[PDB]
Design a binder for this molecule. Sequence first.
Ligand code: ANP
Ligand code: ATP
Ligand code: ADP
Ligand code: MG
Lengths: 1245, 678
Amino acid sequence: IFTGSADIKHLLPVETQEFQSISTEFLALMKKVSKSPLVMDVLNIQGVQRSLERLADLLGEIQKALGEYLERERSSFPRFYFVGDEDLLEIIGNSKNVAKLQKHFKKMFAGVSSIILNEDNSVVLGISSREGEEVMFKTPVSITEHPKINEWLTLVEKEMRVTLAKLLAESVTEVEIFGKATSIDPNTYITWIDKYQAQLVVLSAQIAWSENVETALSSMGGGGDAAPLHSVLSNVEVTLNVLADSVLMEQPPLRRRKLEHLITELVHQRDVTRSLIKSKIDNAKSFEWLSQMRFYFDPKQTDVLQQLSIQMANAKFNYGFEYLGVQDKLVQTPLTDRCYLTMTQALEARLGGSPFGPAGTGKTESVKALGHQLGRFVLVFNCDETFDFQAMGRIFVGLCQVGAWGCFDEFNRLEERMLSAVSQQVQCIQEALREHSNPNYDKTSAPITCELLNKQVKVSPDMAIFITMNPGSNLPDNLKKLFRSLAMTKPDRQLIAQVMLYSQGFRTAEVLANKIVPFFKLCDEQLSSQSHYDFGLRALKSVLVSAGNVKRERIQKIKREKEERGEAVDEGEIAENLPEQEILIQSVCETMVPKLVAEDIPLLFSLLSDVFPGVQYHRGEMTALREELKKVCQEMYLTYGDGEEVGGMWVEKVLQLYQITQINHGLMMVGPSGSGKSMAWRVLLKALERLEGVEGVAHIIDPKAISKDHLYGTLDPNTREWTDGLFTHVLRKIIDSVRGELQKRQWIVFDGDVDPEWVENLNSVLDDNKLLTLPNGERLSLPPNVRIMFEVQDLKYATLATVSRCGMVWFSEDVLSTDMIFNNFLARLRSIPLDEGEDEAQRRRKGKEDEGEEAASPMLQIQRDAATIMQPYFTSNGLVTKALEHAFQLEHIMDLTRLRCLGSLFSMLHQACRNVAQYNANHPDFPMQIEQLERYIQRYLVYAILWSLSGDSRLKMRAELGEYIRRITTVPLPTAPNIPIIDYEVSISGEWSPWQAKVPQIEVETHKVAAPDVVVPTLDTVRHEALLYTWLAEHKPLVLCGPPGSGKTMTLFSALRALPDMEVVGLNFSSATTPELLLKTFDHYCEYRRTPNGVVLAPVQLGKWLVLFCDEINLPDMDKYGTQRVISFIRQMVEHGGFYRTSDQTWVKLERIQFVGACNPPTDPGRKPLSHRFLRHVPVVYVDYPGPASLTQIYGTFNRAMLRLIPSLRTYAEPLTAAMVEFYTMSQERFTQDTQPHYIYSPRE
Amino acid sequence: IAKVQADEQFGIWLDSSSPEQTVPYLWSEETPATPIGQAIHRLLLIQAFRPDRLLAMAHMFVSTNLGESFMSIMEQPLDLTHIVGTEVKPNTPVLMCSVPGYDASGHVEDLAAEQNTQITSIAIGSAEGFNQADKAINTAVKSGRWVMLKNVHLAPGWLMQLEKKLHSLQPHACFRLFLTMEINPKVPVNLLRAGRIFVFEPPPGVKANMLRTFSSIPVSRICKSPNERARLYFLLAWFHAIIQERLRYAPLGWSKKYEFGESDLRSACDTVDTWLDDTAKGRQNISPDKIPWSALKTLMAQSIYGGRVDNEFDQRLLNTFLERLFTTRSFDSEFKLACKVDGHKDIQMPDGIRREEFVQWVELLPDTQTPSWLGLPNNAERVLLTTQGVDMISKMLKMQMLEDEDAWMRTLHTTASNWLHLIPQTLSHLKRTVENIKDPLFRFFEREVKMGAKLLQDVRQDLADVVQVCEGKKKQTNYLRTLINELVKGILPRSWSHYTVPAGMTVIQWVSDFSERIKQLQNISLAAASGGAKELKNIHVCLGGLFVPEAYITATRQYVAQANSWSLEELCLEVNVTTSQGATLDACSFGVTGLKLQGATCNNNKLSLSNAISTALPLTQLRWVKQTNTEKKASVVTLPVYLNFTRADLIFTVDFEIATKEDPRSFYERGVAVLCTE
Ligand SMILES: Nc1ncnc2c1ncn2[C@@H]1O[C@H](COP(=O)(O)OP(=O)(O)NP(=O)(O)O)[C@@H](O)[C@H]1O
Ligand SMILES: Nc1ncnc2c1ncn2[C@@H]1O[C@H](COP(=O)(O)OP(=O)(O)OP(=O)(O)O)[C@@H](O)[C@H]1O
Ligand SMILES: Nc1ncnc2c1ncn2[C@@H]1O[C@H](COP(=O)(O)OP(=O)(O)O)[C@@H](O)[C@H]1O
Ligand SMILES: [Mg+2]
């Protein structure tokens, strides 16, 4: 406190001097301790105990003095009780730096977001709201004459109230003319609306209507003549017509809000006057008029807090002239009228209020509206894991002292300790309030008090407390007697929709409201329940506002179209002849369909057709963007369609993504894995690059791979220095714009699972504030160029707070058909040389078509011919499609995803054409003929189909798939009866050949009979190393699963070490393994080198491919939100080809790094399933047990080695080896894990 | 059965008011039975024929076994003097628990006055009260004084601390500690275990309720001018009685048990005082017309008592009561507080004007109160008793085998075997296609079949495991052991409840409803498979047998809208009750069965008030028609259609025409309704 602020010296000089003399002594003592940090040496310091007791006493005294001073400052200006200790110290310390105070007014005042100041900051001229609405003081507050912060802040509050009352007087005086006029000139009415604030405008309208109705009812006076009320209704309807005409025009936003508020108030006034006329009310003291809220303005009152009196039945409140800004008004439904009546009755009886009901029924908003109608500062306290208790006593004292309301939203959600403590505090406050009501207590001298924070706090009468509740339930037993409860079970959807649609200028609102309201409930019931769906009233109101915006856009479109021609223009005439239902259904579809799952979209359209018959939503045509999408899709080897074609849904989804990016500043793609969301976003960025001539930059971050501290940057607990996190570093880089980043357009994409923990800081940015706040105290303003994006497989663990702020496009799995992926594969084959690597990757963009480069290499020709051979089998009903559909029926240990199988198959076909190229290189005198090429690739396609689809399944199911392929295929297969098709290899020549020919029979030394880590060649081993080489040629991350002891680790190590280039690093994963293990391994074997392209991680050994063995990929523990950190880290490495150095907060790229894993099946207890965004990249093989033939071969080799010691028993080698196998197999058949958990057998035995 | 058929005098017994005293001899005996044998046989017969009298019959069984005066001592005023003097030790606190809204400290004060013993009373409502109570107890434990702590349920943790303190003391002989509380579950279990519990309840009746209300109100408040005020208070008191006693007869009296407590009464009195002070302005008299009746009706309909009411139908009932009572005609000497009491008699307003006249009129009321005082039908009492009757037997089922541990698995094996045999083995899933998915009915029935099949597999697996445990094949796991604990006692396990059902249901009713629901699901699935979705319209669906019949109503509305190309908003519902066999259904008409009509009989599609508890509605045609601009006829009543007898969930509402010139308000006071299932 005493060095952070330099002005504290002037406020508290004596305490400053005492703290100086204390700090010197304490520093000396700490130096002495530092020179001898032993406990016993410290204890023997001369007089340490008495010195420390003196220091404790004096520090306690100075802290007491500081607390008393801050409490005095709080009591001088009571609104500071809503401000924390550090914030109040900042406010007082920066008394001369007024700009720093500007951020704290939103906590103290209801609407004042800042204070307008003279250029020298010596006089306060007025106040301003969040929306920019300003109230200019009639008499400015001179800071120079009142230098103390509390004094001129109190004067600012006083002048706010005085000027609001004085402007309300003029507003009422001006609107009285419109009240008594048969016709209202629209220009004068709009000028009056502009001249005065929204709050005073609505108050003036209400005051005029109340006074006119009062004068009318006085004039009728028992004669039964209803003409004056008819005149009042006529004037109200004339004003409504004027406002309806004015709101269809194009208006500034503030004036539009004022017009909307006036319409919402005047509809209620019209309804009340119609009710009075229908009931034939003929006396001002009849209850039908008294039960309606009434406004009595007495300009002659000298005091400015008892001029406007708001009355409802018994209750007679005064308007506290607290500036509220442009608040959101509430459609005064009969339920809200009941709420107002009961709540004002409770306030008149000094009881508390308890509107209880289901969620989203307007309870807290109705209480807020009631408090704002009377001008009293409302302060809603949320009760969902953000309940700041340590300020709650301070907040209660502030409410009591200043006079202000407090509403607890969902008070049930407080935990039992929290509930009981707050219940006791509110009970004491309510008893203090109820003490007012007694008549014997004369209020000439009545200082009411309550026991709060062990002090007697004076309670003002204007204060009140409200407790919203959610049944299922009852209020705490302390407050059951003191609180009046009201059942807000079911709000009036129809009338709210009616009033809002009428406010937007719709000619027909009754029919539209009565249609749209049941439609939303129909969608809520019929559609499959999902977390992201939101058919509550907030969504409905937002949809109706969007419909109004679309209507106004159509008016402007027709107006400008006619103006470019020769025509006479009138806004009302254009608005008359339009379909309102088309606008409303368009808004509903545009707001809902992006969120809709593919299963639910036809149900939604059926419901929409039912509710809105004969009305259809034609999608707005974007010709330019669609042409750019076509260009980029052909450039990136992607299919494009014009809707209802192959790829129409994907084009529609990227268009919806463009729409949501245009609307919102934050959005998500929440499809399943392998639906094209990341590809769609990339295509959209590269298409807007051409369309708008603005450079698209992407910053892709995996948030769960990196820790939150590194992500957002952490403050050093000592030796204060700020280290920017990765996200904060990116934001600061774009904000500074050293390389002109403001000119460019940049999108940040959080490509990883969303969790509550790492999105707390991002909530402020994603909200309308658009401000990142850090523990450093810096406030980064998000510029308009930034668009924070999300990719998630699902939002299972995403908070509703995060989902609400962001737009969303659900990329259902049936947006990317199999035909699209096959077309992508065949297009990549025909134009990407398969051997040239990455040096020619840049040259792909040099040529827009690469003319004259058809024969880039013989590899291109060979793979083009291979694609020609392979095209008939990749059709929409070809061999591959039927095989995949059948394979999806088969159970696999790992979850069978479409793109995993397809990527495996594509890699195998890549290796097929590579093998053809190898044969051509080895036969330069006569290369591969097209007949041999046809036979070879036809057989290889079947072989790869088997090993990609049934490569994860048992041997019996591999045989099943082989039988199905044999049924449906035209390619010849092996003609040996009792051999599975998987046992055969495809030779370089087209004909098949058994694998058994390629497995040698070796002899093992007696030295290493049981530890030949070089695997004895068996049929499974040769198959699996062949597949290992095929899938390592493409650098795909191989994974092998199987039961324990099957032999996956040995086969992996032997196959990897057989290669000359591969440098194996053996890492074993555990439950506590993290990204830190992989980073440490890279630091060990690899190194970072700077290049013009960027920072590159590479192995130290040149020309060697570093491959990481992850022996147990499954075993790392999932977080609380079901994600393995290391798996996501490996996923981002293999998919993006790099990762972010957190220390430097910079992107680095892997150059010669690979991953190859082993696993047990996820059914085993210690294991977990892998993320589907990760399993897509890895091809998984199932290493089952060797079986009788392989075991006989392996242990024939071992026993022939073992019997070499004794030369008379060599002849008994083979008979023994069968026995060791046979009995073992018999045991494996007789004893299973079902009988006992430990009856497990493997070749380890 | 044959004896019942042959008995000519059976009907007079069956309609008798006290059948239990004269049960006929029907059981066959090889030897003459003992008196207790006759008692238990009569108990079985009364359970079979007249369950509403079962409790009374049960009392006779007790009188047949444990003496006539056995139960009588409880039907008496509580004699706390001898009990606290002799049967209570000084260290055992006297816990006086009361139902909410009732205070029992007056009993302790009266006892302290009678015994001439100084008593210190402290109200625990704040942290200070704990210190005062500790000081008072530390003084009295040494000096042997009497201590009373009022409303201690507000402090559970401090009550635990007090129990721990009490375990360590060495109190004086004359020391006594009374703790008055309201019955809540937050009181510590150990304190209840280590204390003498006395349960206090208010005496049921309108008479006692009005007497308590008049005693609670100060005399000066009612005696204040103008003279009319007291009469209003009487009406208010009567009103507060009528709503309160009616809560006994829930779900018939009210849709749910609201907390109409004394706070509402004080708020109403304050409202009346404020409005009469405003209107009279000190006049000694004001005419009955000048009383602001509209203000009182609106405020006690929306602010005082209506705030707690969430159901719209209970709000309508409250409006009917307030409009019937609070009116100028209340000041006429001929006003009737309750019409057709017992169907023949009426209750007249007192003709006095002072408080004493009304108090005397209340004191002179008859002691014999029927439901007709509150507007309910007399057989409502016959309903309430049989509910309590079931509440007896089920409670005894929760006592049958936790005390008794001898054979319980021998019978549970047979019970679970029968339950497995009852439930069908499987529920075939519907075959979704492109054509039938457009049908809303197929979507609804597919969702229903999915939920039913899942829950069916759950229950079948649980029962199979239970039978395996009873045979010794399977060991008792924790979940399984809890399941046997629930099933043996007849409690419905939480693991089985995944659709809305009545609370407190035994397991046999649940599995029987299960069998009916699954049979309905099988029938509709077979119909869909055979004739496609087109047969889903012509099938007569029991809304009771659906897990969410509101979805069925919405689906029928959607089907009519799709067929006739009308908007959903423009369709309105009408009901036709047809007794004719083979009544053809129109294209917009859907059949329903299993509906029950509580409190009325439907003849010629017209309602008439009836004394029958429930009447089975025949095939009911729900017809959707374009909403014509038809004026709401005065002879039209908007009944609800509740899901089941608890009336917790409302499916929709039905407009019915009234056969006679009966007031529609009588249907609201009578609580007439419709239930999808009994
Ligand atoms: N072809 C083979 N030649 C020789 N030994 C083999 C062969 N196949 C399996 N084995 C034996 O099988 C056992 C298992 O070896 P190992 O590769 O460690 O299994 P593992 O699946 O990696 N165990 P784990 O990593 O925990 O799943 C060893 O005793 C090997 O010697
Ligand atoms: N428009 C398209 N036409 C053809 N193929 C496409 C198209 N979009 C995507 N694909 C194919 O689908 C694959 C998956 O798409 P994308 O790279 O966007 O991944 P994703 O759906 O975000 O999946 P993941 O969960 O693995 O990140 C792409 O690699 C490409 O093979
Ligand atoms: N009568 C009404 N008029 C206008 N808007 C309403 C009305 N009732 C509810 N709403 C809207 O519905 C939303 C309900 O949220 P809120 O009142 O904040 O919490 P809850 O309703 O869950 O207590 C509000 O944002 C409000 O704008
Ligand atoms: Mg992606």
